Every structure is written in C-alpha cells, then in structure tokens.
C-alpha cells in the first residue's frame, strides 16, 4: 500500500518488478489457504451426513 | 472535470484566438511590410502550440478515465 | 447518477434479513415444502413474498451496517420457526389425529402410516378456501411491525413451555369419541371369551375393528371436524402475547 | 436509442425466472410432482423429464400474450419527442400482461398488499383502500406478482387434493383386507402399488387432465 | 386471398411504358393487375401473387 | 451457412432435453426401476448404471433418423433465391421424426392441439411432442403393472404359510426376498425383456 | 483483513454440526423422543416438533456466549507486533464458551486426549457426558411407565381376560394420565433450570 | 473525477460484496436449520 | 495430433460412466450391498467403504489391459500414409479389450444385437446384462445359511408358549458370529479374483 | 516445484475418500451405531451427532504421524540430481503410516493381493477387509449382555400368565442400567484408543 | 496530494504555452501521474477480484 | 463481398464511407442474435437441470 | 408439380437471342419450358422443373 503511495517506488522499474513479484505472491499464497480451507472443510461434511 | 483542464488553457491567454484574427486582417490590408508580416510569424506560430497541447493533454487524460471505468468491473 | 444505482442496492441488502425470517415457514407448511415445490421456482417465490411485507421503505439506507451479523442470522431464523410453528398448529394436531386412530385400530403393529396423511391435506384445504392465505400473510406483516431488526426481540419463554400439553389436550379431545367405543367392544367381546373359552377373540378383534373405528367417526364427520380446524387457526391479535424487544 | 438496447439485454437476464413466478407454470409443475408423490413413486418418473412437458404446454398457452410484445416493439415509431409518453408507450405495451395477471388473480389477496405497502411507504395514517378500487384503479406491477403465485398455489393444491382422493380410498381397504386376515406383519404398500397403476390408466387420467387445464386458460373454437 | 403482398418501386432511367412494352413483348401482361403508376415517371405501384 | 452455425449450437445444447423427453428412452428409463422396486430394492444396482443401458437402447433406434438428417443436409443445393423453398426443404428433412413420432401418438390429442387428413399435411412438432410422451408414459405405467404381478404372487404366498405356522410375528421380507430374485434369474428375465423391448419399435 | 473472512464465513459452513456436537442439544434431543417411546406411538409428537423445541432452548443457552464473542472483538485494537500476543486474544475470546464447557465434562478423557485446558479434548468428553446424564433422568422418568401397564394386564389376569392384547387397552391409559399430570410441560421446565437462569 | 472517481471504485465495489455476503450467510444459516430438522 | 487430444480428453470424460458399465465394478458394488442387508443391517458399513473395496479390486484386473494399449498409444509409429492403415492401428490397439467383454458374455444375445469379431457396441448391453444375472444367483446363495437360521429360532419360540415375540433381535448377532466364524471377508475376496486370476 | 504443489491438490481433493477408507476411522464409526441397534432404537441418538465423536477419535491418533510428513518434506534436501534416490526419498516419508498399516493387516491376504516391504497400493484393502473382520467381533461381543436380557425378560412373564403382552418394554429398562452402571460409555471408547496409542 | 502539485503547473503554462524549460518539467509530471493513476486503479480491483472468489467458493 | 471484390467500388472514396457502414451492420446483427439466443438457450437451461 | 422453382436472371453482353442458339445447338432446347422475354435485352424470366 505505501509501496503505491510512495511515488518515488513507482516510477522506477526494477522496483516495479520486485512488487510485480510481491502482488503475484500475495495471490498464490491467500488462495492457496482458501482452498485447502475449503477442501478442508469440503471433506467434512459427507463424512457426517455419511 | 474535463471542463476545467479545457478551460484552463482558455482562461490563461486573455485574448489570443481574437490577436491572431486582428493580426491577419492587417496582413490582409497590405501584405508587403516588413513590420507587419515579422510580427505575424511571431503571432501565427503561438497558435498552432496552444490548440495540441489544448487537445493532447485531454486525449491522455481521456483514456485514464477510460482505464479506470474498466477496473470497475 | 450514484443514488440509483444506491436504490436497486439497498433492496438487495434489504431482502437477506427479509429471508431469514421467513424461509423456514416455507419449510413447515403442507403445500409450501420441498416435497410439494421444485428447486427451480422455490428461491423465485420465498425473496418476493419478503419484498411486499418488509416494514421500511426500500430506498432508504437500512441500519444493518455492521452492527452484528452472524447472531442477527441466527435470531431471525429463531423467531422464524416460532412462526411456522405456530401456523403449523392446526394441521400438526389434526396429523396427530389420525394417527391415534389410525394406532387404535390395529395396521401399525408391525414396528414392534397413509391415513394420518389424509387428514392432514384434508384440512390444508379447507383451512385454505375461506380466508386462508389472507392471514398467514398478516401475522408476518404485524411481526416487523413489532419484532423490526436491530432490537433483538425474543419468543418470551415462560409461555413457550406449555406449548407441547396444548397441543395434546387439544389432540386427547379430538380422539375422544372413537377411541372410547373400540375399547368397549373389545372388553365386550372380552366377556364373550369368558363365556365361549376357544374363540381366540383376539384375532377376531382384528378383523371387525377397523371397520368399527371408521364408521362411528362419519356421524360427525360433517358437522364437526371443518369448523375445529378454522378456530384453531392462529390470529394476528395474538401476536403481543408471545414477543418482546430487548432495547 | 442505443441504452434502449441495454434495456432489452437487461431484460433478457431476469427471463427464466419471471418464468419460475410470473406465468401459470408454477400450476403444471407442482401438480405432475404431486401426482409422483400420490402414486408413491420416488425417483420415477425422473422429474428432469417432467420439467419439460410441464414447460411445453404452459408456453403454448402463453404464446399469443408473448407474440403481442414482438410486433408492439419492432414498430418504427419507438423514439416519442416527450419523456411522459414514452413512459406511457412502455405502459401501455405492458397491459396485455397487466390484465390477464388481474383476471386470474385473487381479489384481496392483491388488495392486501397495496394497503400493506402504502403503510410502508408514508405511515399509518394513510386510509385504506377497500374493495371499491377495482372499477378504475389498477395496482402496480410489483404488488401483483406475489399475490398472484401463492394464489395459484392454492388452486394447484385445490387439483392435487382432488385426485389425492381415489388413491387413498384404495389404501384403506388394501390395509383392512390384509388384517381381515392375520397379516399385520406385512407391508401393505407393495399389495396397494399395482392396483394403484390401473386405477390411473384405466381411467386415463393423462390424456384427460391435460386436456382440463387448457380449458382453464383458453377456449376452442 | 391473404397471402396478397404489395410494393412501391421508384426507376431511375427507365420509364412505365416500356416496361409496359417488356410485359407486353414477354407475355407477362395481366389485365387483372395491372401497374398503378403516372405514365412516364419512376414510381409505381404492384399488387398481386407471391410469384 | 454462418447462421447454420447457430442451429447446429442450438441443437446440441436442447440435445440432452429432447432426448430426455420426444424417444422411446423414457420407457426404458422407467422399467428398468420399477423392476428394482418390485424386487424390494432401493439401491441396487443404482441409479447411474441404469441410465447407461437405458441411452445405448435408445441409441440404437433413434441413430437412423438422426443419419439421414447429415446426407441430406450436407446437400449441395442449399443455394435457393427462395425463402419458402428452404424452408420446405427443412421441413422435409424433418419428416422423419414426424413419421417416428405419428406412429406413436395419438390422433385425437394431437388435433385438440392443433385447435389452440395427415397425408395432405403433416402436423406440427410442437403439437405432438407432449402428446408422444403423455402416451409412452402411460404405456411404460401398463406394461409396469404386468411385470409387477408375478413378485405378488411370492409375496403373498409366503406370508400365508408363516400363518399356516403359528409363527405371525415375522418379517416375511428377509424371506420373501431370496425368494425373490430366483423366480428372475430362472426366467432369465433380464436378457428377454430388452429382446422385446426392441422389437417393440423395430421389427426383426 | 480477509484473513478474517474465511474464519467468520467457516463458522458459518460448520454451524449445523457444532450444533449437532457441542452444545445440549445432544441431551435435549433425545429425551423427547424417549420418553415418545415410552409411550409408544412413534409420530405423535411427530419428532419434527420434538425437534423443533429443542433447537431454540438450545439457542438460548449458546446465544449469551454468542454475543460475548463479538462485543470483546469489536475493539479493534487487536494488531501488536508479537505473533502470539494476537494469537493469546484470539484465545480470549473462546474462554467465554470453554468456561461453559470446561463446567460440565470429566476430568478423565481431557487429560487423556492431551498426553496422547486444550480445545480439542472437550468436545468427545462433553457429547459423552451429556449422554450419560440424559439416560438416567429418561430411566426416572420410565419407572413410572413400567408400573402402569404392569396393573391393567394385571386385572385381566384378576379377571378371565388372559387371551387379549394388552396393548390396545393400557395405550390409551397411557396417555391420558401424563397429560393429566401435565407431564409435558414438566420435564421441558425441569430440564431448562439445569443448564441456566431460565426466564 | 481522477480523485473522485477512485474513491467511487471502491466504494461501489465494497457495498456489493458485502450484500453477496449477506445473502450466502442465509443461505448457509436456513440450511444449517433445514438438515438438522431432518435431522 | 490435435484430434488425438480429444480422444485422449473423449476417454477420460466417459470415463465415469464407462466404469459405471464397462467394467466388473458392476459385479462388484452389487455383492457388498446384497450380503449388507443379508445380515439384516441397514446402513451400518458404509455407502462409501463397499464403494471403495469395489472399485480398487476393480483396477487391478482392467489395469494389464490398459497398460498394452497405453503403450500402443506411447508408440509413435501409429501414423501412416492411408485412411484403412490409420484404423489398423485403433482396432490392434483396441482387441485386447473386447477378449474379455467376449469372454463373460452370452454369445446369441451379441449375435441378437448384430441386426443393429463383434464390435464394442454389441457388447456392452451383453455385458451388464450378463453379468448381473450371474451377480444375483450367488447373491441368493449366500442368502441360504441365513434363511435357515431364523425359521428355527422361531421355531424354539415357538416351541414355548411364546407367541407374542420379535425373534429378529435373537438371530441378528447369530446372523453374524456365523459370518466371522466363517471369515467370509476373505473368503469372497478370493473367490472373484479366480474367475480372472 | 509446481509437480509438489498440484500432488498436494491432489491429496485434498482424494482427503474425504481416504478417511472414509483407509485409516481406523471405519472402526470407530461402525461399533458407535452398533451400539444403538443393540439397544434397539432407530434413530437415537440420530446417527448426525455420532458420526462427529467417530471423526474427532480417529483424527486425534493421525496427527502425530501426519506431522511427520511435514518434518520430512518441508525441509530442503530434497534437491537430488538424480531422479531414483528422490523416488526413495518420498518412499521413506510414508514410512511410519506404511508401517501402521502393516501393524493391523494380516499376513497373508497383502501378499496375495501384491501377486495381483509389501507395496502400500496392495494393503489398502487388506487393511479394511481385517478391520470389519474385527469390527464385527466387537460387534458381536458389546451385543453379547442383551441376549441374556431378552431371554430373561420373556421367562419372568412366562412365569406369570402375562404371555399376551410383549417383553418389550420391559427389556428396554434393564438394557440401559447394564450399561450406565456398568459405565460402557468411557469402558468402550478408552479401550478403543487404547490400543493404537501409550499415555 | 499528489494531484494537488500535478495541478499547480497546468497554470504557469497557461498563462506562457510557449515556454520550453515549463513543458519539459510538465512532460515529467504528467507522464508520471499518468503511472500513479491506472496502478493504483489496478492494484485495488485485485483486492477487489481474490475477495469476491472466496465466496464463489464457499457459496 | 462482391462490393469488396468488385475493384472499382474499393477505391472510390464515396463508396468508402457506406464499405465502413455495412461492415458494421453485419457485425451488430449477427452479434445481437448470438446473444440473444444464448439467453434463450440458456433460460431453458435452468429450469430443466433443477 | 409441387417442385417448380423460379428465377429471373440477367446478361451482360449476350443478347436472348444469341442464348437461345446454343440451346438448339446443343439439343437442350425444350418447347414446352420456353423463354419469355424481350429478344435484344439482358433480363429473361425462366421457369420450370428445378434440374
């Protein structure tokens, strides 16, 4: 956020790809315990309607 | 919005798209004399400076909005 | 042009609590559940119903925001069922009914039931032809107007507890009249086994039964049956006795 | 002109489910479950199939008010020069709609929920409308439509009760014929199923209910 | 009688007359329907069959 | 022929439902349940499995109608200045369901919807459509009452001799039940009525 | 923040099995239905009903805990720089319903399911309790219908009635004198005074 | 607009997920209520 | 090779329904549940642990069959220059499959089917058709020591004078501690592999 | 790297299935309901609520075995240039749950199943087919009380000339205080985890 | 703020649109305002789009 | 595409500005009934897939 | 005779009168489904059966 709000991190571009790496990431990683939280609780229900 | 960034170029020069017209109809009267036609080039070319970046500065400006309507959706 | 597009969303917002009061009524009655509807034009009829009913005006903004919502679910769903089973009094005593003499007459001693069920859509009917559907509609057109969310109104549990007894005596009165006259032919065919010893009056008891407990049952039939289930049907006046707001 | 056709892609995304409240297919579909249910069948007859049949029929009673909207808003002289009479033109293009929901709609059951939204809308203190409207005034398009659905529910179960009857008079006597005997350890629903088919196909209920319900809707000839 | 269709067909180098004279020439010419027209002009006006 | 690419899209996705509703699959789909019901069975062998015998059956009658319906239409002379030649032309290709579907309807119910002989015209497809599948439905429900009616029999049976024994309080379904399933094996009832089945429609 | 709604869109997904688990529902539940079989006529009161009184009792008890959850974590004053410092507030606020779970389990398989208090131990022993408590009141409540039936076969046997069935006389004396002792709404008042302060 | 508008693209997009939450949360909440009075 | 990629991708989305019908996990998902209500018990096991003994026995019989025509396909000289040449190698490739559908079914019944070296489509109706009328008849055999066991404790009932009892919760655990005592478990698990192996 | 992570999106969408199949799960979950068809009810306790206790057992004697997968492929070893050792390497991360599935399993039944040190495709159902083996010993074994109990029941009655009435209402009492004084409830369940686990 | 000193140079040049060091100074103001808009427009509907697909999910 | 083949029509630029209108009428139409139809085809959709 | 198909079709620099040789030339030219049309223009009307 204060990487954006800083004017000076956006102009340059090798800090432009070092936050290109860090939003990619920020998906991957919160989708990832999404998922597994959903297949996590994905495998509990029909084990107790069973 | 897109009024204003118009209009700050139409109310920074006072008088300038009238200076141009006066200027021409003197060249109109009598186009041989040295002072009236030096004068032009100095008022004709300042002209053609003032409606691009009148109309540039609106087309970049015009697609930034057009690129945040986008990322609603 | 924001406040437009402001009206059609806050509607939206407006029906989700308009749905938890009122899905699990849609559950309990006789001609509204699953195994009467389909999938497909159930969620079409259950949010509209709640859009005709819903106490605030609809483009205003609703004081849902973020006040507390995952309890505000559970409260609404709780004061739902004691509408559904309140409304669902008649039809569960008269599905009570026919179970007891449908348990009197022999045909359900093979645990140790399909006429039980015609009672009970023989008084969906009737209940639904005069008036009907104009009632179930104003006793939650009266509940915002006393249980509005945000406030936290509760079912008032010290009259709750004599819900069940109500019912039954409601349930032993009905079953009155049958179930006295089978059980005095029995003692009385009891007495002929004493009097003729090798009759096995037990199974002889089978066979005559069942056509003795339905037949007393059609002399009142008629005249007495369809009106019990228009007085039991629960009224809107009512509404004061079983709710109040907490602040 | 062109946010006209917006307005006609929007209206094609709500289609289906004006389908599942506005039209009468909400009569044939909960009827042809209830004669599944009646007959104890639980899986057959494999209702995917009998959305379909049920949908076929309701359309084909629905296609002349339908076919009223195509030639009303291909006409030419859509674009008006006032913004009243061009709300009153797409008014005016609902009203074929309008009435038949006002013909076999419920009377008060409608009248509730104008009295009931007018409270809403500014207070108490707004008088009641009573029976007396119905001459000259007409109610709006959303207080309609749900009076209108729990309104042919109740018709619909008035049918599904009615042929609940002659099956249910056969499941008696099959459960009073096996305890004339000492047969009460038997499950009488498997006795009960055969006879339960004849008595639907002897009679011909399909090919004469089907016929029943159009007569509710439209003549012949 | 319903299936009856009309039109309106405006020519821009060629008159009513000798087109009069194609149908004539051809053996198209029906009395029964004729073209309703002004004689030396573009526009005229054809009702008849489909075909 | 870019709008043919439409009608081709158009048929494939209303595929699964024509299927569902205007063959002979519906009479197949139902007889091969309540053949599970008779036996006292719920889930056995299920409902999956019995949905795939029941679409290759189906496959077999109905893939002529459908075979014609390429050859005909990959025909060069879809070029026609015509509107109604074409549309002639379409309607000939699809006088091959017409014929399947006439056989199998009823006369006096189509005409009742053709008010809201056949040889000068053929009626309408929306106009048959239901009433094809309001009389497999009901002859699927007739030929399901006869094969119900042997299973009564040994249903019946046994439970009178328990009660020629004083012995009246017994389940008779853990009895009856391998009881059951030999009087459909000793038939070979399974390979005898898909025999007929097909015989039904097309002959030998 | 989004981290925070897949754990309050979670609860969501597991509320009809924390219901089904980890309050008194369990013994609400089942002594209505037992004392349904003491009578012996299986749809009367046609356990839906039976079931649909002992989901709001129940409501009522977990609600107090409910609201105490949410008013602790409306300070949003939660984010400091330890991990565990958030990890301990979290805990907090789940005190509120284990001090309601840590009054009513033993002290056998929660020691045991923490060698082989911690959260995951109480649940099994709590189910396991609760089960145990509900059938020796539903026991105390049969004893007076074991005595019942055993006087009117009694009085046939007084009389020359040894060859009819019994249960088609004593089952409508059965009802007639719980509903007469207004039993219904006794063992519902009796079983609301345990877990709180009812009304 | 630059700043108005920016300010407009979240505030649109928020209300709108909070009301998809709302109704999925009764969706759950009646369905959790509906199988356990199956039970 | 582009079209390859949809038979690769046509195969796997039959793929449920294909052992839905085409292999002997229709003869095994039937014996599981037929001896579950054998023993007079409802639910208890599962609907999902017979499941799962059924289709892993399942996979080791179709997997040597699978694995030749999977290195027919991880063959690469399957192209050629004609049209007939290209279906020598899908019908080579594919024979090995239908030696076994051949072998468990009846052959008039395929040959019934040829008015419409067999083809895979005469087959499959044969197939399941076959194969759950053999399921059923030892399906009924091993009702047989559990038809007997009830009929004589009623018969001790009915030796006293114990006319008004339920005998069902009396041979219940007999209806098991026979099946242990036998280890039936294994027993059945032996026996279908041999119609194979 | 990505060939790691799409085997573990393959673990959580098989997850369900293998702790309905594979582990010791089947045991618990059997003899809970078992216990129930003993006492004769049919819907009590409402096999919901048991199908929880079974999960939370079972999953509690899991966890220190699966913490050992994590330990094992969570470090930074695994970087192998050549591709057999690797296939070893995840060999051996299995090692303990391999070596519990043998522990349970007979003999000779894996060994004509890998005929098709054993491979882990092959005792799969080697393992379930000896756990309901042994779960219906258990099955046999709890149920054991109760047929002295129906038994008993009918003679007292036979004694008297009560033979119309049936016994069994009178065998239901007698059928919970064997086995709430007996205590069964914590006899069962700690005797059940006993046997994988040491305190 | 940052629009605040992009538009206190769009007068000076309004007043004199001919000066060549007051465009040059513009050019790398508004270019650069031009990177501040559309990043920041982009990074928020990511915030927007992951959050919307949980609930796709859980729904 | 007989006005595009045709190659006198192609470079006239009065016959230009109608190339340009045409090309688009055939793209709004065809569009128009893609979607259109693919609603049609999908309100069906939802009611028989349940 | 429910098969006949129509069109009317027009030439650029062959006259009627120049196609109409090269039916009879060729042996295709049929009485009964003549011609009809203006003899030196470029429009003519044919009909008939559709091979």
Same mark, same amino acid.
């Not at chain 4, 029976?131 to 000259?136: C, F, T």
């Given at each position: 956020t204060n990487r954006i709000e800083d004017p000076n991190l956006v102009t340059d571009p090798k800090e432009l790809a070092i936050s290109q790496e860090m939003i990619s990431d920020y998906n991957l990683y919160v989708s990832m315990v999404s998922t597994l939280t959903r297949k996590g609780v994905g495998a509990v229900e029909t084990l107790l309607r069973s | 919005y897109l009024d204003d960034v118009s209009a700050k170029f139409d109310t920074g020069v006072d008088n300038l798209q009238t200076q141009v017209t006066e200027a021409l109809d003197k060249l109109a009267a009598k186009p041989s004399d040295p002072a009236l036609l030096a004068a032009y080039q100095s008022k004709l070319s300042e002209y053609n400076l003032y409606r691009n970046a009148q109309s540039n500065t609106v087309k970049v400006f015009k697609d930034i909005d057009a690129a945040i309507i986008q990322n609603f959706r | 042009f924001y406040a437009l597009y402001f009206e059609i969303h806050h509607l939206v917002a407006s029906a989700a609590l308009g749905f938890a009061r009122v899905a699990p009524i849609f559950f309990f009655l006789p001609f509204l559940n699953s195994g009467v509807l389909s999938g497909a034009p159930r969620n079409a009829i259950i949010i509209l119903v709640a859009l005709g009913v819903w106490?605030?005006?609809?483009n205003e903004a609703p &004081?849902? =925001?973020?006040?507390?919502?995952i309890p505000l679910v559970l409260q609404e769903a709780a004061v739902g069922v004691m509408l559904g089973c309140l409304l669902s009094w008649p039809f569960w005593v008269m599905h009570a009914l026919g179970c007891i003499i449908d348990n009197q007459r022999g045909?359900?001693?093979?645990?140790?039931?399909?006429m039980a069920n015609f009672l009970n859509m023989f008084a969906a009917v009737v209940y639904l032809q005069n008036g009907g559907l104009v009632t179930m509609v104003d006793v939650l057109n009266k509940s915002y107007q006393l249980?509005?969310?945000?406030?936290?109104?509760? &079912?008032? =549990?010290p009259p709750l507890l004599t819900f069940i007894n109500q019912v039954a005596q409601n349930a032993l009165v009905l079953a009155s009249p049958v179930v006295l006259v089978l059980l005095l032919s029995e003692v009385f065919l009891g007495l002929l086994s004493r009097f003729?010893?090798?009759?096995?009056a037990f199974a002889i008891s089978l066979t005559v039964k069942s056509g003795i407990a339905v037949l007393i049952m059609l002399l009142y039939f008629s005249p007495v049956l369809p009106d019990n289930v228009l007085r039991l049907?629960?009224?809107?006046?009512?509404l004061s006795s079983w709710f109040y707001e907490r602040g | 002109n062109d946010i006209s056709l917006i307005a006609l892609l929007a209206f094609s995304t709500l289609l289906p489910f004006i389908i599942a409240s506005g039209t009468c297919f909400v009569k044939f579909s909960i009827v042809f479950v209830m004669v599944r249910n009646a007959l104890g069948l639980?899986?057959?007859?494999?209702?995917?199939?009998l959305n379909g049949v049920a949908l076929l029929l309701s359309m084909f009673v629905m296609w002349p008010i339908m076919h009223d909207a195509y030639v009303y808003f291909e006409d030419?002289?859509?674009?008006?020069?006032?913004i009243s009479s061009l709300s009153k033109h797409v008014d005016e293009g609902l009203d074929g709609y309008r009435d038949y929901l006002i013909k076999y709609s419920d009377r008060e059951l409608v009248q509730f929920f104008e009295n009931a939204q007018l409270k809403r809308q500014?207070?108490?203190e707004t008088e009641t409308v009573k029976?007396?409207?119905?001459?000259?005034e007409k109610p709006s398009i959303f207080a309609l439509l749900p009076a209108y659905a729990l309104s042919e529910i109740k018709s619909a179960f008035k049918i599904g009760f009615y042929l609940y009857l002659p099956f249910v008079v056969v499941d008696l006597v099959v459960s009073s014929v096996l305890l004339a005997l000492g047969?009460?350890?038997?499950?009488?629903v498997t006795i009960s199923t055969p006879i339960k088919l004849v008595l639907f196909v002897a009679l011909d209920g399909w090919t004469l209910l089907s016929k029943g319900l159009i007569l509710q809707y439209m003549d012949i000839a | 009688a319903s299936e009856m269709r009309n039109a309106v067909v405006s020519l821009?180098?060629?008159?009513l007359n000798e087109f009069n004279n194609f149908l004539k020439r051809s053996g198209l010419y029906n009395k029964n329907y004729p073209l309703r027209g002004d004689?030396?002009?573009g526009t005229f006006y054809v009702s008849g069959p489909p075909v």
């Open positions: - | - | 106490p605030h005006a609809l &004081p849902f =925001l973020s006040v507390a919502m045909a359900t001693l093979s645990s140790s039931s399909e249980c509005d969310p945000m406030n936290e109104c509760t &079912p008032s =549990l003729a010893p090798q009759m096995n049907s629960f009224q809107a006046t009512g | 639980q899986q057959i007859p494999s209702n995917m199939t030419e002289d859509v674009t008006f020069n006032d500014y207070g108490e029976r007396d409207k119905d001459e000259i047969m009460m350890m038997m499950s009488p | 821009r180098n060629v008159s004689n030396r002009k």
